[PDB]
Structure 1
Amino acid sequence: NVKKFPEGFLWGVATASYQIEGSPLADGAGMSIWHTFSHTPGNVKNGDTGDVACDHYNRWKEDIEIIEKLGVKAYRFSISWPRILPEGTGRVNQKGLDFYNRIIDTLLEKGITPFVTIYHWDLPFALQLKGGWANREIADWFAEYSRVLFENFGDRVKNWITLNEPWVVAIVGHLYGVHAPGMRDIYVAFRAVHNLLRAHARAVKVFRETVKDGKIGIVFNNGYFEPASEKEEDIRAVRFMHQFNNYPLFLNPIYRGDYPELVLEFAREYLPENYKDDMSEIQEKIDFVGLNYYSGHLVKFDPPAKVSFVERDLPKTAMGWEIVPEGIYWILKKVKEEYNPPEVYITENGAAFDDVVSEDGRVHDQNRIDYLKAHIGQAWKAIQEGVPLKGYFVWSLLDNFEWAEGYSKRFGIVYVDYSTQKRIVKDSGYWYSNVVKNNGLE
């Protein structure tokens, strides 16, 4: 019944710069790849872009006041690299720093803990013209950007995330071409894997030199994969998927100094020739792992990657994603088993549903409450069995720009009416507000 969480526990909400801010070119900001990608015809559902989004660039104080009012203790947000360095390196844009300075000061004043994601997918367009994640030099560009953030904010911000979901950045951005920069080349995609690791390790290195009382980690996407059958090949296709799609792709290098075994079987041809020379620097020690989780997937060997998904009955979200709450427990347990990081946070968990405002003026998203409650329950369980889970972040505070899905997927615990920019706290937000005050369930 009563599920009480440890005394430190960070109850959070999460967003990302391009998904909420709008005004991408205000105050001397450079273009990002998401600006140019979403302005290209055919890339994003309905032609949506981040031009306006939630207009958080102007409504930031109101949004933080919502966090405060809700009593949420932690806010995960990201910094737009091209607001800070419009050409990606070199010149620093003081007006960009001032924007994030105001948010950071406001959160602190109100006793909310800022968790800053350095990179959440809005690469400066000027760097994409030099190859972006494909170019080894990005490890230097990233290091320089990080240094600027640390020097300017590291006095007040003490919790930092280098990369958001590097699997997505590499594979969805450069192999599937579904996300910026919209490329479909498997050799580029694995070079981007590798460069993401090198840039992450370089930023951690600079962090130790500039923020000596801080903590820094990295965030990965994960699915709960289960075999279709009990056949050998099926259980194996599952071991491939976990190793490729989940945290091992990056944590195997960071903790063991090489890519996971089945990843090398499939992908050694696509990785740079002497990639191993980079591994010792890649092992730079991190303070925490962020794990994201939304769903589970039935999979079977199928004679690309030799793997297919099979649709299951099971309730789904508006994303079409299977609701499998024990996934979050499984992934929490697995991460302890495989690499034993000293701290873990759930950095994303949530759901998209076809929310509507009822005539009573409220959003009755019982479907999201049920979703959040089940998963918070599974994360509690993991804590009872010794996973050092220190925090939990709902994706998202606000309905926002859902990348190639545009505004048509609503993940917020607060509804946004895009025609007026009005915020409506959903039932799920009130519910979560109660969970945070009680520090856990029922």
Structure 2
Amino acid sequence: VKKFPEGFLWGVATASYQIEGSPLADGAGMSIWHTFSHTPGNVKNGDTGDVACDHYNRWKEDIEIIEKLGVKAYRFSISWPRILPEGTGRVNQKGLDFYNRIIDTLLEKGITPFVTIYHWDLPFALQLKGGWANREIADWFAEYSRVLFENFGDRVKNWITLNEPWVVAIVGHLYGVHAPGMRDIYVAFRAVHNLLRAHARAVKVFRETVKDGKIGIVFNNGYFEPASEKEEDIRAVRFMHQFNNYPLFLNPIYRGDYPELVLEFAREYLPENYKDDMSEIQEKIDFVGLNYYSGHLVKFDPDAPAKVSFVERDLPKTAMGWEIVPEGIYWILKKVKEEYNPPEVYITENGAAFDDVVSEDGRVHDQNRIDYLKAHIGQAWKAIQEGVPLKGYFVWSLLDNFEWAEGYSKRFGIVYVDYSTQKRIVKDSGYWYSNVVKNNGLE
């Protein structure tokens, strides 16, 4: 029996573009994901978020599933261009109405909302002006955030500024695999920097506009291990942790500068005078959200960008090919405590894609996903016994949904969605997780 602390917050998570559909309904502006996915060759099978799970229309049924499973919290994101179709300026009242109904409904049902302000669907109007490459985005994001706070902050008390700024900057602007689909390392590092600047502006206006609220920010993380005991492999791991995991952003927030090995690799790409912005970047936050899915073996590789390469291991893998290493969620939780000692931490995403099917009995028996979640939840419990102030844990995702450049081919839900009919079928993992929440842990 692994019982969690009293009041621990068990949650499920989604993001706007991945579930909503109806990107241009009710006068909403285009986002960069609408334009990126409508560009041939960017997304597997030419999939787009045009329909997705049709949560734009089916939101009430989806919330009723959260209630039925007795899940305590719901992390979801708001689509910036539904609110400000031009990025700034004119507020779209129908966009407020859509999210107001969701928020009111969650409260009515005793479900705690955690709002992600930005989960990647930048208004296309702002991309035309350079998007995350433009220092002015700190002002644009501050405006958008204030709008959300003044409208929703009387009811929503738990907020997240950015989902995975490393991904937004590096996958979006260096690899070009996510919107806006660019490949320029100087632009990517300026994005990393402007994301931090925008985050800090949002937190500053939050303190002015929301009463009794908490605000945080969410990082992707992997558990990197050395391919050997050679010192250069151990160093490769340190560089991968500093660059790919929370330190890239938490070293600035808590210490006022980038990590040492990131500066070693990337000082050239950062704005000259970037450090002038650090004092404002250190705006105090209430909690750190960590996402965690996978572990990676890494080695020094003299002929690789940043002199590091991944090494494939013979470990169990999900349908993404991602290695399942549950102790990594323990490691990242312990390590964030040791390195930055944030007052509170949440696992804001953990979960897995598997090739789910509906069996002849009409149920979706996804035992692989149960076993994945069970092992990670036990490891999170271990971190708590060792003093990590973990306040909550959110499964990615409530629903199978649009998995970015992989399209609909990768299913992460605890609820299956048949995209031909939009029927929801709660998976075994959903009923299993319902029991975890009921027992406040594993038995």
Q: TM-score range by the shorter chain?
A: over 0.9
- The alpha-carbon deviation at position 8 of structure 1 amounts to 1.6
Q: Deviations over 1:179-206 (max 9, x none)?
A: 0000000000000000000000000000
- Structure 1 distance, partners of 2:156, 2:271, is 36
Q: Deviations over 1:59-114 (max 9, x none)?
A: 00000000000000000000000000000000000000000000000000000000
Preserved contact between residue 318 and residue 352 of structure 2 (Cα < 8 Å):
yes
- Structure 2 distance, partners of 1:283, 1:212, is 21
> Kindly, what percent of the aligned residue pairs are identical?
100
Q: Deviations over 1:335-358 (max 9, x none)?
A: 000000000000000000000000
Match of residue 324 from structure 1: 325
Preserved contact between residue 415 and residue 426 of structure 2 (Cα < 8 Å):
yes
SS at match of 2:91: coil
- Structure 1 distance, partners of 2:187, 2:103, is 36
Preserved contact between residue 154 and residue 211 of structure 2 (Cα < 8 Å):
no
Q: Deviations over 1:151-191 (max 9, x none)?
A: 00000000000000000000000000000000000000000
Q: Deviations over 1:273-331 (max 9, x none)?
A: 00000000000000000000001000000011100001000100000000000000000
- Structure 2 distance, partners of 1:150, 1:212, is 10
Q: Deviations over 1:250-274 (max 9, x none)?
A: 0000000000000000000000000
- Structure 2 distance, partners of 1:196, 1:314, is 35
- Structure 2 distance, partners of 1:390, 1:283, is 23
- Structure 2 distance, partners of 1:249, 1:225, is 15
Q: Deviations over 1:329-387 (max 9, x none)?
A: 00000000000000000000000000000001111111000000000000000000000
- Structure 2 distance, partners of 1:402, 1:72, is 23
**Structure 1: 5+ residue runs without aligned partners?**
none
- The alpha-carbon deviation at position 212 of structure 1 amounts to 2.7
- Structure 2 distance, partners of 1:58, 1:229, is 52
Is the aligned partner of 1:418 residue 2:410?
A: no
1:172-191 alignment, distance < 5 Å:
172-191=171-190
- The alpha-carbon deviation at position 144 of structure 1 amounts to 0.3
TM-score for the superposition, normalised by structure 2: 0.99
Q: CA RMSD in A?
A: 0.3
- Structure 2 distance, partners of 1:431, 1:284, is 40
SS at match of 1:393: strand
Is the aligned partner of 1:366 residue 2:359?
A: no
- Structure 2 distance, partners of 1:312, 1:367, is 19
Preserved contact between residue 141 and residue 198 of structure 2 (Cα < 8 Å):
yes
Equivalenced residue count is 441
Q: Deviations over 1:205-231 (max 9, x none)?
A: 000000131000000000000000100
- Structure 2 distance, partners of 1:193, 1:390, is 27
Preserved contact between residue 223 and residue 331 of structure 2 (Cα < 8 Å):
yes
Q: Deviations over 1:24-81 (max 9, x none)?
A: 0000000000000000000000000000000000000000000000000000000000
- Structure 1 distance, partners of 2:412, 2:247, is 27
- Structure 2 distance, partners of 1:231, 1:182, is 37
- Structure 1 distance, partners of 2:191, 2:256, is 17
Q: Could you list the runs of 4 or more consecutive aligned residues of structure 1 that deviate by over 6 angstroms after TM superposition?
A: none
- Structure 1 distance, partners of 2:58, 2:363, is 21
- Structure 1 distance, partners of 2:312, 2:270, is 32
Preserved contact between residue 14 and residue 396 of structure 2 (Cα < 8 Å):
yes
**Structure 2: 5+ residue runs without aligned partners?**
none
- Structure 1 distance, partners of 2:151, 2:312, is 48
Q: Deviations over 1:225-257 (max 9, x none)?
A: 000010000000000000000000000000000
- Structure 1 distance, partners of 2:7, 2:176, is 41
- Structure 2 distance, partners of 1:384, 1:229, is 30
- Structure 1 distance, partners of 2:355, 2:140, is 40
SS at match of 2:306: coil
Match of residue 125 from structure 2: 126
